[PDB]
Paper text:
α-Synuclein is the major component of the filamentous inclusions found in several neurodegenerative diseases, including Parkinson’s disease (PD), dementia with Lewy bodies (DLB) and multiple system atrophy (MSA).
The structure of the minority filaments (Type 2, 17% of total) was solved to 2.8 Å resolution. Two identical protofilaments are linked by pseudo-21 symmetry. The ordered protofilament core spans residues G41-V95 and adopts a similar fold to that of protofilament A of Type 1 filament, with minor differences in the relative positions of their amino- and carboxy-terminal parts.
Residue numbers in the entry:
A (entry chain A), B (entry chain A), C (entry chain A), D (entry chain C), E (entry chain C), F (entry chain C): 40 to 97
Write the structure that this text describes.
Amino acid sequence: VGSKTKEGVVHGVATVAEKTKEQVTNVGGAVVTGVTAVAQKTVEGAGSIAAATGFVKK
Amino acid sequence: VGSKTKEGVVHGVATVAEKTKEQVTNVGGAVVTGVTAVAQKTVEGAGSIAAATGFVKK
Amino acid sequence: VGSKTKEGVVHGVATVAEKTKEQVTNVGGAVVTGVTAVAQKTVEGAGSIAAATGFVKK
Amino acid sequence: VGSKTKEGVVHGVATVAEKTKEQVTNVGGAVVTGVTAVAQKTVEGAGSIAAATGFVKK
Amino acid sequence: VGSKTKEGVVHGVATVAEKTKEQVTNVGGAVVTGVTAVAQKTVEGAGSIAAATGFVKK
Amino acid sequence: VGSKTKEGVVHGVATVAEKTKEQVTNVGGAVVTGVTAVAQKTVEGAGSIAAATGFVKK
């Protein structure tokens, strides 16, 4: 077989964040912020970085 | 077989963020912000970075 | 078989964060912030970095 | 005076180098290679990244 | 005076080097290689990252 | 005076080196290799990362 396989992998990531401000006001939601490397490998489901699937009575 | 395979992979990502401001007001939604490298490999589901699938009575 | 396999792996990540401010006000939501390397390999479920799936009566 | 002052400064530098080969055969010379951020603030002299001034009898 | 002052400063530097090969054969020279952040603030002299000034009789 | 002052300073430096090979054969020279953050603040002299000034009779 001799089979290499990479599922859902993050390699080699350099980041410099300098004097970044940030402000979040959230109510019942999903929020994702900033420097964001993401590998996903979902099987038989909903892959998703920000998911908001609920009721909010404001 | 001898079969290499990369599913959902992020490699080699450099980022410099300098004096970035950011402000989020969310209510029941999905929000994704900033520098964002994303590999997804969904199978039998909805791949999606910001998903908003719910009721909101503001 | 001779089969290498990487599922859900993060390697080689350098980060410098310098004078980053941050402010979160959350109510019933999901919030993810800052420098964020993430590998996921969900099977038979919803992979997701910020998930918000509940009721909020503000 | 009340003066901010940056002379010769390197801030905020991200780098990913992946499977870079390199081969140098040098004889009496200057060689500079690879990823190279350089701030230089010479006063009353020769600023220079590769300088080669000697004798070479090959 | 009341003065902030940065001379020759390197702040905030992220680096990932992965499977980098390198080979140097040098004879009497200067060689500088790889990932290289350099702040330099020479006064009354020759700033220089690779300097080669000698005799070489090959 | 009331003065802050940074001369020759290296702050905030992250590095990941993974499976880096390296080979140097040097004879009478200067060689500098690899990941290299350098702040230098020479006064009344030659700042220089690789300096090669000698005699070499090969």
